[PDB]
């Protein structure tokens, strides 16, 4: 339960810098590439006015009361469907 690395004898700053630049930041760079390759907008699904979604029991305290705080017109329909 310790990966396949293995370099001790008096832990220190030099080893944790080695891990930072040799394992941790390369992994971030790999996941960044993976993410940037699967990016791009996907086709939004048909709108269906499901009653368990788009809940409105009280108007929101901003805007017109009917838009969520990080409303994205492209992918977040209102209770009455997508905005034009």
């Amino acid at each position: 339960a310790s990966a396949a690395k293995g370099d001790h004898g008096g832990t220190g700053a030099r080893t944790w810098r080695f891990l930072t630049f040799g394992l941790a930041l390369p992994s971030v760079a790999l996941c960044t590439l993976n993410s940037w390759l699967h990016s791009g907008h996907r086709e939004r699904p048909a709108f269906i006015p499901y009653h368990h979604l788009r809940i409105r029991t009280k108007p929101f305290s901003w805007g017109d009361g009917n838009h969520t705080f990080f409303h994205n017109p492209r992918v977040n329909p209102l209770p009455t469907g997508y905005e034009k």
Partner: protein, 259 residues
């Protein structure tokens, strides 16, 4: 003259201003939710920030500049930080209990399934996996910073701490983008509720932890920390590891198992 090692604190106005800031924030949220006005809330947020700034400023004055943090005082502050983190763990435990309650027993209104009918979860292998690598990496770089500081290496402490902060900011910006791009919202039933309230309080804690690391960065630029005495840095690192571990549990529970 005392002959114990503990700190008798000068009489202070910040407890009262912090309490009044809490009154103004809460009455302010009430005014915003029910009386269409942000005024009280803005005043309360401002006085809260002023209180935090002057209070922790004074703690730096009492310790770096006046010498009151003997080993006994520092040990108390270690216990205090550990106990504070434990209370924050239990706060998150309440939101995880809500998530598992709703997802392990999906009601008919959802379609009787999880994720609910009509919910299209984010792909956990895209930006959520990137966010995981980013916070895990920041736990490695903050450990490098801690060892550099203990070994008396100013430049590499600053480099490693800057990288840690940069990753915290990267996470925050990625999560903000994910919030904007998500096709479901907080109003999308219990899926949106659990998703945004649990990840949203976690995001708040990333912002708090990042701010705390930034405070440590500037104190380090100003030579406050010695190679053996730097509890503010240790507390910020403990808090940062807490934020990282809460993220791993959100990733596994909500993003992966809950997809």
């Amino acid at each position: 003259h005392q002959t114990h090692a503990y700190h008798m604190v000068n009489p202070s106005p910040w407890p009262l201003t912090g309490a009044l800031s809490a009154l103004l924030m809460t009455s302010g949220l009430t005014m915003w939710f029910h009386f269409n006005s942000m005024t009280l809330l803005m005043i309360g947020l401002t006085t809260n920030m002023l209180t935090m700034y002057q209070w922790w400023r004074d703690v730096i004055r009492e310790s770096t500049f006046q010498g009151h943090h003997t080993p006994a005082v520092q040990k108390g502050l270690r216990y205090g930080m550990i106990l504070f983190i434990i209370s924050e763990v239990l706060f998150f435990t309440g939101f995880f209990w809500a998530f598992y309650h709703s997802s392990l027993a999906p009601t008919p209104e959802l379609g009787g399934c999880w994720p609910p009918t009509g919910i299209h979860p984010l792909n956990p292998l895209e930006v959520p996996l990137l966010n995981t690598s980013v916070l895990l990496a920041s736990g490695v770089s903050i450990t490098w910073a801690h060892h550099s500081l203990m070994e008396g290496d100013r430049k590499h402490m600053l480099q490693a701490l800057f990288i840690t902060i940069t990753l915290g900011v990267y996470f925050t910006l990625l999560q903000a983008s994910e919030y904007y791009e998500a096709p479901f919202t907080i109003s999308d039933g219990v899926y949106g509720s659990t998703f945004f309230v649990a990840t949203g309080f976690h995001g708040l804690h990333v912002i708090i932890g990042s701010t705390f690391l930034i405070v440590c960065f500037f104190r380090q630029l100003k030579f406050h920390f010695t190679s053996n005495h730097h509890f503010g840095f240790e507390a910020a690192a403990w808090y940062w590891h807490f934020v990282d571990v809460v993220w791993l549990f959100l990733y596994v529970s909500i993003y992966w198992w809950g997809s």
